[model samples]
Target: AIAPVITIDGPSGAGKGTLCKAMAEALQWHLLDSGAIYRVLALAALHHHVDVASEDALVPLASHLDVRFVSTNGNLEVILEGEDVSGEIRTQEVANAASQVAAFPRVREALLRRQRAFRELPGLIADGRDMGTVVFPDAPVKIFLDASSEERAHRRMLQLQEKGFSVNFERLLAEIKLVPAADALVLDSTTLSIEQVIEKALQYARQKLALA
Candidate 1:
């Protein structure tokens, strides 16, 4: 049987990475760091000189990416394309062409198959921007992790401040206050410990999904 997947959809600062990592390890499941895919795509595109706006040009590149979606402080390996004839593009050309597209039909079709290919036994834990939507809409389990603005601000400040930096979370957070309405379950982890948050999230998922 194809391994089942669990999608953890969450805000940028809600500790989804921490929670996802622990879940994958404890369950002995494969971990798909889906966010790394996009970042890698962007960096590779920039380094190799491709217009980020060239959807027709970009789709295939995005689709056929071979990335070692690695963690911080990780090693690197050579990614190749059968040797190259030429490459290089401009910076503003990439940035200026940011937003365009919508779909009742399709948007990220190029990446859909590549994303799903991550599914395999014993299980898979996928956490990303659209994991519950495009990546695996039929996933038996999904979580929407959230934190109050004050809570997220606190956590964010702590993380950055530890590196000898400072920031305030008020206005920055007010902008992101409205959570997307499409998530399966919204976990307000504002006051919960990571342990409690994961425990509740997983407990709810298993019970709700009837996962054995």
Candidate 2:
């Protein structure tokens, strides 16, 4: 039998990452940050001077992509091509590149198996724009979190500022709405606390998974 999967899909800056982390922690389940895969692929392409629109070149790059995720000191580390690129790949540049590459159906298809590998015994918490709709269609639990563009931008600004980077709220909001998933339980996080969001998410998850 296949292992259970809990998919959390949403637009950018929709609190999917934080909610995925919280859900994984609560259930002691393995987590899959699917966007990180796209981000790493984009970074790799940029480093190699590969064109983002060229699927032929991107397919091979995505298939043999040498990336690893490690947990250190309670933080996630991203390794690309035998080098630690955790910090480099999260830049807004890489993020924009990732969004571009992710729009290609071929590029997403190439990485499907790699994403599915995260589903193993116990369970998996999969997070991305299309986790539920495309990658993990059979996932028992699916959630789509959202928030007002302004509120999302505000949250993103604070997050980036905390990381010591200057942020532009308008630009962030513009980028957040570029990509969205279908058939997701979209919830606005603008007026909801993290706890409130989690409570609603858990309620839906329980119904899907038939949990008491």
Candidate 3:
């Protein structure tokens, strides 16, 4: 009865978070926003001077990325390699740099098993740029939420005002649109609410999932 998950693949400000929250609330499943994890791997590589552009260099680091997200006194800290590079990675510098590392095929292969760990019993909703295509291909519902660049920029602009992220908006969108054929159940989320998106995904998963 568990397709076990519904992966929503898109960029940061693409409203994936909002959609995820709505879907998880409706289905009562675990939701994972893997950006923090991605950020750390980028930081770890930056600190260790690993050539993120090199698969051979990044494969080893991705396999053994000593990164963890922890909460202390109600504050979050991104600890990598026994140090906190939290503040540093939040800037556009690391995110821009990290995208290179995230490009390697092996980089995702490394985290594949780790993510599948949570795809157990109840359900899981994984959110990431490569989630549907690379991270959770087995997910029953793999939706490709597309928006016109102009429309995306509008939503994206609103996101910048709401959240604090040094990562350049243009660059993020560029990465999001990088998927060659990594498409899925299409939705023009250009003009829709978070709940609206979830509703579409929910109906699709319920109908498509063989659990019924």
Candidate 4:
């Protein structure tokens, strides 16, 4: 039998990354940051000077993109083409590029298998915009986390600032799909504390997966 999967889908700065990290830590399962996949692809395109608007140019890069997620002592290192880019892809430049390339249907198709391959024996935590709806439609536990646009922007600004990226709050305000997948639990974290969010999600996911 295939391993179980828990899909956590949400918009940017909705705390999906933090929640995924906590969930994976709690469950001791494999983790897939689907957004990073596109971010890496976009960074690769920029490095190669590929036209982001050209689907034809981007599709090939998407297929052959050499990206790796190295986890050591609970830290994730994103590598692209043998170079460490853990910090590079999170920049506003690459984030914008990611959204551009991710819009091409064919580009997403090319990376679908690469994303699904993260599933393994113990289990998997898949995080992305379309993780539950398009990527892992049959996932037993699916969550859609959201917050107000202002809250999301504020959170993102703080996060980027902590990472030493000088960001304009208004520019980061735009970015989401409010649609929840069928059977997915939707959480509005607009007023929820991080601990509260994690606690609620862990409880619901554990119950759905029949875990202790």
Candidate 5:
């Protein structure tokens, strides 16, 4: 039988990362952080001085991207070009660059197979904005996690602060719809604690995938 997949798609700061990690651990499944791909590619381009706005400059770089995700102590470390860039890729500069580079159809096309290859034996927990609607439409369990702009901005603020980064709340509040997949369970994380979100999501995933 093919491996089952649980896809959690949502906007940033909605706790999709936290939710995906918890579910991956709970089910002992592989995890895919799809946004990391774009972030890594953006970092790669920046380091190599490639033109971020040119599709021609990005497709090849994406196809030949050398990025890796290593798990240690239940945390994922992102590596790019033989350098540990887990923190570097999270910066706003790289994030904006990732946004620009990710808009190219060919760049996404190049990385699509790489994303799909993460699905393996046991199962997988895929996380991204389009995992349910685009990348993993056949995934058995899908969730669209969301939150109010104010709450999400607040969450982002705390997260960046913890990382020793400064952020403007108003700017962040303006930065974030997302449409839910027809088959997905839509969740508003505006008021739920992380634990509460996990319990409800994990229960739904278990039921959908028939996990013991």
Candidate 6:
């Protein structure tokens, strides 16, 4: 029997990360953070001093990318080229660069097989901008989580602040709306708690998977 998959696709800061993480933990499913792949590619381009706009350069990089996720103290530690890059890949620069690379059709195609390889055993919870639409089109459950840019930025601010990073709300909000998924469960998380979002997502997954 083929293992099941639940995909949560959405723009940044829309609670898709939190929702996917919670669902993965609750269901004990393998998890795939597709954004991290984009971020890693962006970081690689920066480290190699390559132009982010060069799809030709980025395509080969994406195909030969070296990255691994290590579980450390309940959190995933990102490693690139045998070095830990867990923190470096999450910066605003990498994020913007990732967005740039993500726009390339070839770059996205290069990473498709690597992303689909995450599906295994019991199940998988895939998260990203195009997981449902592009990577895992056959996923039984698909969710498109979203929120008003203002609310998403507010939530992001709180998260960054807790990490001791000060951010500009307007700039953050602008970034959040830059990308949109083609098809998904589309929910406005602006007024909803993470638990509420998880509950709704889980309910939908159960129904789609026909869990009794």
lDDT of each prediction vs. the true structure?
0.63, 0.80, 0.68, 0.85, 0.85, 0.80
Report the candidate with higher TM-score, 1 versus 6. Answer: 6
- Model 4 per-residue lDDT tens digits across residues 1-212: 17999999888888888888888888788878887898999999999999999999998888887776655555778888998999898788999999999899999998897787777879988888888888889899899998888878888789778888878777877542146898899888887887898999999987887875
In model 2, where do residues sit more than 4 Å from their true spots? 44-58, 66-74, 81-83, 92-105, 167-186, 206-212
TM-score of 1: 0.69
lDDT tens string, model 6, 1-212?
Answer: 18998888876677877787778778877878887998998999999988999999988888888776544334777788999898998688888999999899999889886678778878888888778887887777778887877877887898799669888888887766624345467666877777788888888878887677
- Number of the candidate with higher lDDT, 2 or 5: 5
Residue-pair clash count for candidate 2: 0
Residue 95 lDDT, candidate 1, scale 0-100? 27
| True-structure lDDT of candidate 5 | 0.85
| TM-score of every candidate | 0.69, 0.74, 0.63, 0.78, 0.82, 0.74
Choose 1 or 3, whichever is better by TM-score: 1
- Give the range where candidate 4 is weakest over 10 consecutive residues by summed lDDT: 170-179
What are the RMSDs of all candidates, in order?
6.1, 3.9, 5.7, 3.5, 2.9, 3.9
- Score candidate 4 by TM-score against the native: 0.78
4 or 6, which is superior by lDDT?
4
Give candidate 4 regions above 4 Å deviation: 45-61, 64-66, 70-75, 81-83, 96-100, 163-177
The TM-score between candidate 3 and the true structure equals 0.63
The reply for model 3, stretches above 4 Å from the true place, is 1-3, 11-13, 34-36, 44-61, 64-89, 103-105, 162-183, 208-212
Report the alpha-carbon TM-score of model 6 versus the true structure: 0.74
lDDT of 6 at 34: 82
Error of 6 at 99 (Å): 5.8
> Which 10-residue window of candidate 2 scores lowest in summed lDDT?
175-184
Put down candidate 5 lDDT per residue, 96-157, tens digits, no spaces: 99999988888889889668877887988888899988888888888999888887888889
Off by over 4 Å in 5: 46-54, 70-74, 81-83, 163-177
True-structure RMSD for candidate 1: 6.1
Off by over 4 Å in 1: 70-107, 158-165, 169-185, 204-212
